[PDB]
Amino acid sequence: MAMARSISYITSTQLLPLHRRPNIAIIDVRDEERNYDGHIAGSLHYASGSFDDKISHLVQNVKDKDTLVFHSALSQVRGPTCARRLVNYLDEKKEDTGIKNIMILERGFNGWEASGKPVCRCAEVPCKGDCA
């Protein structure tokens, strides 16, 4: 009942009605190497030494088709922080949002970490969306 107007999270099913196409990707920030501590799937984690040199980078590579999901887990608390930095860059430039549509994942990888063994293991490089 009125809860889907850009800049919002989507439930497991909410992903069905949309599922635009590969144009979607999940952004994460913390260090990447310090977050996984092993392997992983989907969503790419990045630094934050600039906080603005990462969204100009994404803005420069909008690729036209672009859907962005932030956090990678379930916005347990950092989600708002994700938007916080979004504001930081947008503050540096203005009306940034290199992404066509920004939303937050309902599951991300909370089930895997929380109730799906520690973290992805395997022994490959391109294993899953993002495995470090």
Q: Footprint of Zn ion on this chain (CB under 5 A)?
A: 39, 120, 122, 127, 131
- How far apart are CB 6 and Zn ion at their closest, in Å? 32
Which C-beta is closer to Zn ion: that of 22 or that of 126?
126
- How far apart are CB 123 and Zn ion at their closest, in Å? 8
List the alpha helices (DSSP H) in 61-118.
79-92, 110-115
Over its C-alpha atoms, the chain yields an Rg (Å, rounded) of 15
Q: Which residue has the tokens 């906080």?
A: 51
- How far apart are CB 24 and Zn ion at their closest, in Å? 20
Which C-beta is closer to Zn ion: that of 9 or that of 36?
36
Which C-beta is closer to Zn ion: that of 40 or that of 102?
40
Comparing every residue's Cβ against Zn ion, the nearest one is 122
DSSP 109: T
DSSP 60: H
Which C-beta is closer to Zn ion: that of 104 or that of 131?
131
**Which residues is the chain interrupted after (C–N above 2.5 Å)?**
none
DSSP 14: T
- How far apart are CB 131 and Zn ion at their closest, in Å? 4
